[PDB]
Design a protein around this ligand. Structure first.
Ligand code: 3PH
Ligand code: PIO
Ligand code: 9Z9
Ligand code: 9Z9
Ligand code: NA
Lengths: 549, 210
């Protein structure tokens, strides 16, 4: 029970199975003893014993990943119940050590044989609640494991589905999705070719992208062109798209992993795209409600549409995030935005000061009105972006008399422009420049980690795009009254034994290489030479002092 | 720059569509709507931010519904395009300059050979007068001392061969002498000799006879 609580919601340890429950309720040996000994050493926080038990037996990498997850969960539980706060550091160090061991073992296995390395990451683990190494590594939030070359190659092979399209893809997928006769000219891995072509994640992604582009074009057409009292066909298509997308979001929030409905919404509202999509759908619904009414309400609904189109235009960054070079740039923008806000507060302060000074100096006969609130922000803000217009600030003053102190406005403006356009923007450039390498590397690692989540969330979605997704939901109603690949890879006993022997060979070679590399370092050689020289000097002094003559 | 201009184009299209749809709600479907999105939002960021043609000052025609959103959308758009993306592009150009410079220098030095060789074959007359050279090639149609190679006699060839043998011998000797004087090799040899000496001394001490 405590193992199942530590691991996750979907995990099911062998102890709580009904076979072991019936075998224990009337109170035999274990097939793999070192699994239970390793779990015992991990739970009771005995690091040396756990490291000794790790290198004996089979399924070494799965054991390392399970140990890393258990240590991370134990550290999280320890730094919650007001503990001594030093147990958490030791548990985190143990988790990091186990993760590093898993990464090094994967590196050795990939270096020795590539196909067997990819084989080792996919086969179903019978002793570990029917999970793969990828699922354990993802559930442990191990960014250095997914970002490895072998994991990325495996993710690419799962993303491409049964097709190959190795040298040049993308265009062929679009041709297939637009020209169904062109499907037959594509090679497949070892009537049925249509089903295997359309069930790949990548063709689902391109179908969804084409549907989104079409919906966006319809939205642009319906907001650009004059609208009548009742909606046109393009507006009906847009409304249908929004409604079906909302239905799909509800279906996703209902079929989530947690069993509690209140827990499902709380875990769904974690990504910012989900909450922003919910807000946008509610806003579009409000605008559509106000649209089908009299003239002022219709105008307000149209303005709601024109505001809402901005978000759906921005949401193209999610589509762009698939590309290898347009995802890290988006994340880099996401962090530099926080830096920009921190540096824009000061610009706002200086702008407010200059605007209030100029407005107070120039116009001393203004009644209290809200126009004074915009005369401060408007023109001092457009000034710095390339609209420095004389005679609009410090006007020439047949000629009306000059206001008292009107000569000070250009003196203030010169210093304001010098501060805003030469000091703060250059300092912001320096800040963006000197904090780019860390942000780039972190963004690359995070994107390579989230590739797995993208692949799974496209492998789970129905094959039809959101404008046609209603037909797929009707099918799910018919199936309501009624994984060979994509996640795992089942095998026989002989292939399992071959994989086990390969893994034992890999771990043995890894330990032997580590020992041979440690024993040949300069520091070890110097230490051993010093000790032997000291002992030899003592022996030689004893020999010289003790002679028969 | 193209990889970074895709995003600028997305944001520009968004702002242009929003402003054009807000301001003018009585436009027939015409191709003029296709350029009203790209034209002015593109000239705005290069120094045409004129504050009288984005939010018109409106004897006075009535104010269009929601015409106060255009300045806010434009302020956010200018802040994104002129402060965030261009500075990030500057950072990208700055932090990927050394590798590009070194690779370009190496590639130019390599292509110098092709540049030199392609002028050693072209006819001496320039393209406006190259017709005369082609006529000459017609006359020569019915009919490399230097520039590429350098033919030499047997004694010069033997001198070059002896020089090359001396060079390769000196190279191998220098490589071996440099390897044998490294710190790692000295430490390894000293450790092995110390181990053997310790074993020998223990065997000598165990070989007492009195
Ligand atoms: C905000 C919801 C209401 C939307 C309806 C009205 C929209 C009117 C204003 C448009 C604002 C839309 C921007 C919201 C996008 C943020 C999404 C997000 O936070 O995901 C986190 C997202 C990922 O988190 P993850 O779920 O863990 O993957 O992080 C990002 O990478 C977002 C970076 C892209 C944002 C740059 C552009 C923002 C400036 C746009 C200003 C408007 C210009 C108009 C001219
Ligand atoms: C208007 C905006 C619409 C949304 C924009 C569409 C969204 C968008 O911009 O990216 C989508 C698409 C995703 O496909 P993705 O990148 O995953 O697939 C790549 C493709 O297979 C390349 O041929 C591979 O070689 P290369 O390394 O590249 O040399 C590349 O490397 P590898 O993994 O096989 O080793 C593959 O990653 O990215 C494109 O490649 C553009 C293909 C042409 C797309 C044509 C678009 C019409
Ligand atoms: C001059 O008078 C023209 C008239 C013929 C009228 O035909 C119209 C048919 C719709 C059409 C082609 C027209 C104007 C706006 C056009 C929109 C601009 C939008 O821009 C795009 C811009 C970029 C896209 C990313 C978004 O959408 C289109 C969805 C959109 C777009 C191309 C939809 C198509 C619209 C012309 C002459 O006949 C006698
Ligand atoms: C159009 O005619 C208006 C009239 C109602 C008149 O009420 C007035 C009450 C004072 C009030 C709210 C008004 C105009 C200037 C307003 C100032 C602008 C300043 O800005 C702020 C700007 C930002 C702050 C950081 C600094 O101060 C305020 C201290 C300041 C401020 C909000 C104080 C409040 C002033 C309107 C209509 O009657 C139906
Ligand atoms: Na300028």
């Amino acid at each position: 029970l405590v193992i199942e609580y530590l691991m996750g919601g979907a995990y099911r340890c062998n102890y709580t199975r009904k076979r072991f429950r019936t075998l224990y309720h009337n109170l035999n040996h274990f097939p793999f003893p070192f699994h239970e000994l390793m779990v015992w050493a991990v739970l009771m926080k005995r690091q040396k014993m756990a490291l000794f038990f790790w290198q004996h037996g089979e399924e070494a990498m799965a054991k390392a990943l399970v140990a890393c997850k258990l240590c991370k969960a134990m550290a999280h539980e320890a730094s919650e119940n007001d503990m001594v706060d030093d147990i958490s550091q030791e548990l985190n160090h143990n988790s990091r050590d186990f993760g590093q061991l898993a990464v090094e073992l994967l590196d050795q296995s990939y270096k020795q044989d590539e196909q067997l390395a990819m084989k080792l990451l996919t086969y179903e683990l019978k002793n570990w609640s029917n999970a793969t190494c990828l699922q354990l590594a993802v559930a442990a939030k191990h960014r250095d494991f997914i970002a490895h070359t072998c994991s990325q190659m495996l993710l690419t092979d799962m993303w491409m589905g049964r097709l190959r399209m190795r040298k040049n893809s993308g265009l062929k997928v679009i041709l297939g999705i637009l020209l169904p006769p062109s499907i037959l000219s594509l090679e497949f891995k070892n009537g049925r070719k249509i089903y295997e072509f359309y069930n790949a994640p990548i063709v689902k992604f391109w179908f969804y992208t084409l549907a989104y582009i079409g919906y966006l074009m319809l939205f642009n057409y319906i907001v650009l062109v004059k609208m009548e009292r009742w909606p046109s066909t393009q507006e009906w298509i847009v409304i249908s798209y929004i409604f079906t997308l909302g239905i799909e979001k509800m279906r996703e929030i209902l079929m989530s992993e947690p069993g509690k409905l209140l827990q499902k919404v709380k875990v769904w509202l974690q990504e910012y795209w989900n909450v922003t999509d919910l807000i946008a759908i509610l806003l579009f619904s409000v605008g559509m409600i106000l649209r089908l009414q009299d003239q002022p309400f219709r105008s307000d609904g149209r303005v709601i549409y024109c505001v809402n189109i901005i978000y759906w235009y921005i949401r193209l960054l999610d589509i762009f995030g698939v590309n290898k070079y347009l995802g890290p740039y988006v994340m880099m923008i996401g962090k530099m935005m926080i830096d920009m806000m921190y540096f824009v507060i000061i610009m706002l302060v200086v702008l407010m000061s200059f605007g209030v000074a100029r407005q107070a100096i120039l116009f001393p006969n203004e009644e209290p009105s809200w126009k004074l609130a915009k005369n401060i922000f408007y023109m001092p803000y457009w000034m710095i972006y390339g609209e420095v217009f004389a005679d609009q600030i410090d006007p020439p003053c047949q000629l009306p008399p000059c206001k008292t102190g009107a000569w000070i406005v250009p003196a203030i403006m010169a210093c304001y422009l010098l501060v805003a356009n030469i000091l703060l923007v250059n300092l912001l450039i320096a800040v963006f420049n000197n904090t780019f390498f860390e942000v780039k590397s972190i963004s690359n690692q995070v994107w390579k980690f989230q590739r797995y989540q993208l692949i799974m969330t496209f492998h789970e979605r129905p094959v039809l795009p959101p404008p046609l997704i209603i037909f797929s939901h009707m099918t799910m109603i018919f199936q309501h009254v009624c994984r060979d690949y994509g996640l795992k890879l089942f095998i026989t006993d002989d292939e399992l034994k071959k994989v086990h022997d390969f893994e034992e060979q890999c771990i043995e070679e890894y330990f032997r290489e580590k020992d041979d590399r440690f024993n040949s370092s300069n520091d070890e050689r110097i230490r051993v030479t010093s000790e032997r020289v000291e002992n030899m000097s003592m022996r030689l002094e004893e020999v010289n002092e003790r002679e028969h003559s």
